[PDB]
Design an enzyme around this catalytic site. Structure first.
Site, PDB file in Angstrom:
ATOM      1  N   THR A  37      28.295  53.844  48.394  1.00 24.51           N
ATOM      2  CA  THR A  37      29.362  53.105  49.067  1.00 24.51           C
ATOM      3  C   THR A  37      30.747  53.023  48.309  1.00 24.51           C
ATOM      4  O   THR A  37      30.787  52.833  46.919  1.00 24.51           O
ATOM      5  CB  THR A  37      28.668  51.602  48.888  1.00 24.51           C
ATOM      6  N   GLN A 114      22.701  57.383  55.824  1.00 25.55           N
ATOM      7  CA  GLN A 114      21.904  56.215  55.148  1.00 25.55           C
ATOM      8  C   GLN A 114      22.061  55.327  56.236  1.00 25.55           C
ATOM      9  O   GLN A 114      23.247  54.578  56.429  1.00 25.55           O
ATOM     10  CB  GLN A 114      22.312  56.082  53.791  1.00 25.55           C
ATOM     11  N   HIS A 191      17.267  52.991  54.252  1.00 25.12           N
ATOM     12  CA  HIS A 191      17.638  52.231  53.045  1.00 25.12           C
ATOM     13  C   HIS A 191      16.708  51.115  53.054  1.00 25.12           C
ATOM     14  O   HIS A 191      16.759  49.961  53.687  1.00 25.12           O
ATOM     15  CB  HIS A 191      18.988  51.673  53.071  1.00 25.12           C
ATOM     16  N   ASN A 194      17.237  48.516  46.824  1.00 21.77           N
ATOM     17  CA  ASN A 194      18.289  47.702  46.311  1.00 21.77           C
ATOM     18  C   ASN A 194      18.555  46.658  46.771  1.00 21.77           C
ATOM     19  O   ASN A 194      19.846  46.012  46.900  1.00 21.77           O
ATOM     20  CB  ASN A 194      19.642  48.757  46.348  1.00 21.77           C
ATOM     21  N   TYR A 196      18.675  45.252  49.825  1.00 25.50           N
ATOM     22  CA  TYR A 196      18.975  44.904  51.296  1.00 25.50           C
ATOM     23  C   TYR A 196      17.884  44.380  52.091  1.00 25.50           C
ATOM     24  O   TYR A 196      16.911  43.911  51.512  1.00 25.50           O
ATOM     25  CB  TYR A 196      19.758  46.294  51.635  1.00 25.50           C
ATOM     26  N   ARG A 243      14.115  55.521  51.390  1.00 25.85           N
ATOM     27  CA  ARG A 243      14.572  54.982  50.028  1.00 25.85           C
ATOM     28  C   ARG A 243      13.860  53.960  49.653  1.00 25.85           C
ATOM     29  O   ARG A 243      14.343  52.962  50.462  1.00 25.85           O
ATOM     30  CB  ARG A 243      16.260  55.037  50.021  1.00 25.85           C
ATOM     31  N   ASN A 251      20.450  42.632  43.499  1.00 25.22           N
ATOM     32  CA  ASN A 251      20.522  41.752  44.814  1.00 25.22           C
ATOM     33  C   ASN A 251      18.995  40.737  44.778  1.00 25.22           C
ATOM     34  O   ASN A 251      18.552  40.455  45.804  1.00 25.22           O
ATOM     35  CB  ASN A 251      20.349  42.778  45.999  1.00 25.22           C
ATOM     36  N   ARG A 348      27.042  57.873  40.198  1.00 29.49           N
ATOM     37  CA  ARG A 348      28.112  57.891  39.614  1.00 29.49           C
ATOM     38  C   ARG A 348      28.884  59.232  39.265  1.00 29.49           C
ATOM     39  O   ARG A 348      30.106  59.196  39.297  1.00 29.49           O
ATOM     40  CB  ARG A 348      27.982  56.835  38.651  1.00 29.49           C
ATOM     41  N   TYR A 375      34.872  50.825  44.291  1.00 28.17           N
ATOM     42  CA  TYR A 375      35.342  50.345  45.427  1.00 28.17           C
ATOM     43  C   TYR A 375      36.717  49.845  45.300  1.00 28.17           C
ATOM     44  O   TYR A 375      37.496  49.015  44.627  1.00 28.17           O
ATOM     45  CB  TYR A 375      34.510  48.774  45.321  1.00 28.17           C
TER      46      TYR A 375
HETATM   47  C1  LIG Z   1      29.663  52.714  43.611  1.00 28.80           C
HETATM   48  C2  LIG Z   1      27.916  52.656  43.740  1.00 28.80           C
HETATM   49  C3  LIG Z   1      27.723  52.482  45.147  1.00 28.80           C
HETATM   50  C4  LIG Z   1      26.696  52.830  45.647  1.00 28.80           C
HETATM   51  N1  LIG Z   1      25.936  52.846  46.887  1.00 28.80           N
HETATM   52  C5  LIG Z   1      25.021  52.841  47.405  1.00 28.80           C
HETATM   53  C6  LIG Z   1      24.519  52.825  48.634  1.00 28.80           C
HETATM   54  O1  LIG Z   1      25.221  52.628  49.466  1.00 28.80           O
HETATM   55  N2  LIG Z   1      23.077  53.172  49.127  1.00 28.80           N
HETATM   56  C7  LIG Z   1      22.170  53.187  48.137  1.00 28.80           C
HETATM   57  O2  LIG Z   1      21.134  53.202  48.453  1.00 28.80           O
HETATM   58  N3  LIG Z   1      22.508  53.018  47.028  1.00 28.80           N
HETATM   59  C8  LIG Z   1      23.976  52.999  46.552  1.00 28.80           C
HETATM   60  N4  LIG Z   1      24.202  52.893  44.991  1.00 28.80           N
HETATM   61  C9  LIG Z   1      23.132  53.342  44.162  1.00 28.80           C
HETATM   62  C10 LIG Z   1      23.067  54.945  43.769  1.00 28.80           C
HETATM   63  O3  LIG Z   1      22.659  55.804  45.103  1.00 28.80           O
HETATM   64  C11 LIG Z   1      22.204  55.411  42.643  1.00 28.80           C
HETATM   65  O4  LIG Z   1      20.931  55.028  42.867  1.00 28.80           O
HETATM   66  C12 LIG Z   1      22.702  54.603  41.353  1.00 28.80           C
HETATM   67  O5  LIG Z   1      24.064  54.582  41.103  1.00 28.80           O
HETATM   68  C13 LIG Z   1      21.979  55.385  40.128  1.00 28.80           C
HETATM   69  O6  LIG Z   1      22.198  56.732  40.221  1.00 28.80           O
HETATM   70  P1  LIG Z   1      23.112  57.085  38.951  1.00 28.80           P
HETATM   71  O7  LIG Z   1      22.822  56.591  37.700  1.00 28.80           O
HETATM   72  O8  LIG Z   1      23.036  58.657  39.029  1.00 28.80           O
HETATM   73  O9  LIG Z   1      24.630  56.506  39.331  1.00 28.80           O
HETATM   74  C14 LIG Z   1      25.315  52.897  44.643  1.00 28.80           C
HETATM   75  C15 LIG Z   1      25.786  52.923  43.272  1.00 28.80           C
HETATM   76  C16 LIG Z   1      27.183  52.904  42.888  1.00 28.80           C
HETATM   77  C17 LIG Z   1      27.472  52.944  41.334  1.00 28.80           C
HETATM   78  C1  LIG Z   2      27.062  48.369  50.660  1.00 32.28           C
HETATM   79  C2  LIG Z   2      26.107  49.065  50.322  1.00 32.28           C
HETATM   80  C3  LIG Z   2      25.567  49.838  51.618  1.00 32.28           C
HETATM   81  C4  LIG Z   2      25.405  49.335  49.073  1.00 32.28           C
HETATM   82  C5  LIG Z   2      26.100  49.277  47.996  1.00 32.28           C
HETATM   83  C6  LIG Z   2      25.646  49.464  46.762  1.00 32.28           C
HETATM   84  C7  LIG Z   2      24.105  49.804  46.646  1.00 32.28           C
HETATM   85  C8  LIG Z   2      23.393  49.831  45.207  1.00 32.28           C
HETATM   86  C9  LIG Z   2      23.591  49.809  47.771  1.00 32.28           C
HETATM   87  O1  LIG Z   2      22.209  49.940  48.014  1.00 32.28           O
HETATM   88  C10 LIG Z   2      24.194  49.723  49.179  1.00 32.28           C
HETATM   89 NA    NA Z   3      32.217  44.082  44.828  1.00 32.47          NA
END
Ligand SMILES: Cc1cc2nc3c(=O)[nH]c(=O)nc-3n(C[C@H](O)[C@H](O)[C@H](O)COP(=O)(O)O)c2cc1C
Ligand SMILES: C=C(C)c1ccc(C)c(O)c1
Ligand code: NA
Ligand SMILES: Cc1cc2nc3c(=O)[nH]c(=O)nc-3n(C[C@H](O)[C@H](O)[C@H](O)COP(=O)(O)O)c2cc1C
Ligand SMILES: C=C(C)c1ccc(C)c(O)c1
Ligand SMILES: [Cl-]
Ligand SMILES: [Cl-]
Ligand SMILES: [Mg+2]
Ligand SMILES: [Mg+2]
Ligand SMILES: [Mg+2]
Ligand SMILES: [Mg+2]
Ligand code: NA
Ligand code: NA
Ligand code: NA
Ligand code: NA
Ligand code: NA
Ligand code: NA
Ligand code: NA
Lengths: 399, 399
Positions: A37, A114, A191, A194, A196, A243, A251, A348, A375
């Site tokens: 995201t 996703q 998804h 995390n 949700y 996932r 959350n 990241r 963001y």
């Molecule tokens: C800015 C940001 C946005 C993320 N958005 C999502 C998301 O939309 N859906 C999701 O399943 N995980 C999301 N995640 C979790 C990442 O997919 C990932 O599992 C997590 O950052 C750990 O991996 P990394 O250490 O390589 O960043 C997000 C993480 C970050 C930092």
């Molecule tokens: C807003 C969304 C779709 C989102 C953002 C961050 C994470 C870790 C996630 O699982 C989902």
């Molecule tokens: Na925020």
């Protein structure tokens, strides 16, 4: 700048650089972009960013044969609640997604959408403004005090879904998946991680229901598995992944503190393997590692050492994508990819390194990320991170 | 003779030779004698062998600080069905057990009674002769065709237990545990493994019930957990362990072919950890490894490579005893005991090596076992296997 203290390792001599087939897609390497995201979608209408999103994905598709999972995409207005995350329900959205998918495919890479439903993570005031409910599994446990209070102030108290409302979400997942494929996506990821909505059903902290959707392992998994089955039927198992984040606490999920958590996730994995053995194997299972129980904590923080995801491999026999703090730990990746059905998601550091795959192969320094622009409504921190070559020209080898 | 092709390794430099506390007992090393049925008890009355059993256990207690789990012991006549396995319900039995426990304690070792209920593994004709039922979880699935037919011929068809009959077994477990402790045992092990009655409830192949004791993970685990709780209440958690064999197929259990099997066992482990965190931690969990899915197949046969017991360690945080083909594999033991709460059960080679612990410490050759005398009414193959010194005197270094 480059990450200062990092000692890179070339991973070209590992299975990270062996091809693998995921669904219909012949990947040329096993470094996956997990869903990220970024909040560049525009309001009103949750529209993928008309100025920058194509460029963002094009940059990150640059290594041929890369699997990209999109940022989370809302399946319907009721599923959403963040104004700057995109949806996949409307024509105006799909016009932009089509351009994104075409751009990724022109770079000989692949794209999986996703599909997201937020539940209690949504902002109840945005939902109220739009005439929408604030949904979760239950109505008597809340993400946090601030969310509970925002919902009450908005005259939109958290609502425990009825069976009919669950069915309506399932219809929306089906249509969102169809929209994604029709627009050119290679597949979808459900998804269920995390914290949700689907995870809110899986977790006994957030799910206090006493109907068929809560109160036991099988009941808590029912919604997730109904979504799996509905999407497999609509678009095919080869176009569907799932996932999960067994040890996540983001959350307000339970993580390892819940002694039943491994059983809950083992049950889901088992049900997926049962379907697979019966001829409908999902393209992949994607796991967030206990290495990262909350992705908004700096790498190394929020690591849970009391559990492993390895159990999933005793149960599910298909591809597994693992994500969480792997960029800074090539020594860990080197060991994990010895398993021939393991892929590695890099989140990241894919934000900050559009050419991450080259850097992993060749053992190059990594660009430091800027969490302040994760963001933001900006091209800055989105499409202006340099490739390694561009970074050298900027003098980053000497900064 | 010594095992011909075996290359021993000295394990004295590993945690196998570090002390550990199990329940009330200060073990001096982590080589455990797992339960081994030997069929020397005498009929009538399932009496521990009056001539040889003390000697058998004395020999195997010889290394100070050894944990010994007895051969399986029936909790009541209805729980039995093998004429030459012992019970722990009668005064005449306990007179002999007392002598055994005293002998083990004189050697500064420890003894835990394994409590057994056979279910469908019992011989229905022996049960019929004695006016007893042939019991299992269900009445419409059978261990094998021969057992089903024997039951019908004996006018003793397999009977699905009523809730009251389950309660009666629980009463018998409680009294058997009390008898064991009063006679001097250090604790008891609940046998919920190897396809006996409790395992018949855990496994969805053998448990087709639609009441609260079947039809879901929680329901299938109910009987085992009720026994755990009843014994913890009666004699204390520090005097109770539980044996499980997640991947076992012996006695027609499912093993890894059942995609829900890891979830079933993860649930049990989680429930044990929940009790532990609430102040009632069992002394140990004892696992049969997928290394041996059937202990009547030669070492190396019947190995299941598709699963690991490692998941249990993510869930249960107490001591874990692991058994299955470890004597011939010191290289595997060396790795497993790096975990500081892991003990190793050695079954078949403790049958043939009364001084096995010395042999493990010092890397000595192992006596070959004689499977023909595993079950026999004889001192031969029971109390006449030599120590290493005695074997040298017999010339086994040159045979
Ligand atoms: C800015 C940001 C946005 C993320 N958005 C999502 C998301 O939309 N859906 C999701 O399943 N995980 C999301 N995640 C979790 C990442 O997919 C990932 O599992 C997590 O950052 C750990 O991996 P990394 O250490 O390589 O960043 C997000 C993480 C970050 C930092
Ligand atoms: C807003 C969304 C779709 C989102 C953002 C961050 C994470 C870790 C996630 O699982 C989902
Ligand atoms: Na925020
Ligand atoms: C002759 C024999 C008798 C056994 N009796 C029992 C028993 O009473 N209770 C039990 O739980 N397991 C019993 N087992 C299984 C063993 O405890 C052990 O798990 C198995 O033999 C694998 O370990 P090993 O390879 O070291 O022999 C028996 C095994 C054998 C070979
Ligand atoms: C007769 C008994 C008590 C018995 C024998 C063998 C095995 C593997 C077992 O689990 C139990
Ligand atoms: Cl917002
Ligand atoms: Cl018999
Ligand atoms: Mg209400
Ligand atoms: Mg800045
Ligand atoms: Mg009948
Ligand atoms: Mg012979
Ligand atoms: Na290197
Ligand atoms: Na611009
Ligand atoms: Na494994
Ligand atoms: Na040695
Ligand atoms: Na004699
Ligand atoms: Na572990
Ligand atoms: Na036999």
């Amino acid at each position: 700048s480059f990450v200062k203290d990092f000692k890179p390792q070339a991973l070209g001599d590992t299975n990270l650089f062996k091809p693998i087939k995921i669904g219909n897609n012949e990947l040329l390497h096993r470094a996956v972009i997990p869903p990220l995201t970024r909040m560049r979608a525009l309001h009103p209408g949750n529209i993928p960013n008309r100025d920058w999103a194509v460029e963002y994905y094009t940059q990150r598709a640059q290594r041929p044969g890369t699997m990209i999972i999109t940022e989370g995409a809302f399946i319907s207005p009721q599923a959403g609640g963040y104004d700057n995350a995109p949806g996949v329900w409307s024509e105006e959205q799909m016009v932009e997604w089509t351009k994104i998918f075409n751009a990724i495919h022109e770079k000989k890479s692949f794209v999986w959408v996703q599909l997201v439903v937020l539940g209690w993570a949504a902002f109840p005031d945005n939902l109220a403004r739009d005439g929408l409910r604030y949904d979760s599994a239950s109505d008597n446990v809340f993400m946090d005090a601030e969310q509970e209070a925002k919902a009450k102030k908005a005259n939109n108290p958290q609502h425990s879904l009825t069976k009919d409302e669950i069915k309506q979400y399932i219809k929306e997942y089906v249509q969102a998946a169809k929209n994604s494929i029709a627009a050119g996506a290679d597949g979808v990821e459900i998804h269920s991680a995390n914290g949700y909505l689907l995870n809110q059903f899986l977790d006994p902290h957030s799910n206090t229901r006493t109907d068929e959707y809560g109160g036991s392992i099988e009941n808590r998994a029912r919604f997730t598995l109904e979504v799996v089955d509905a999407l497999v039927e609509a678009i095919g198992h080869e176009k569907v992944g799932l996932r999960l984040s067994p040890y996540g606490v983001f959350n307000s999920m339970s993580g390892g503190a819940e002694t039943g958590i491994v059983a809950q996730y083992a049950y889901v994995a088992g049900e997926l393997e049962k379907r697979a053995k019966a001829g409908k194997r999902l393209a992949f299972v994607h796991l967030v590692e206990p290495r990262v129980t909350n992705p908004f904590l700096t790498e190394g923080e929020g690591e849970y050492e009391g559990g492993s995801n390895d159990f999933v491999y005793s149960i599910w026999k298909g591809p597994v994508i693992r994500a969480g703090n792997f960029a800074l730990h090539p020594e860990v990746v080197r060991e994990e990819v010895k398993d021939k059905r393991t892929l590695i998601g890099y989140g990241r550091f894919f934000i900050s390194n559009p050419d991450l795959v080259d850097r992993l192969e060749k053992g190059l320094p990594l660009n430091k990320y800027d969490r302040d622009t994760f963001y933001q409504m900006s091209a800055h921190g989105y499409i202006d991170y340099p490739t390694y070559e561009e970074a050298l020209k900027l003098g980053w080898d000497k900064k």
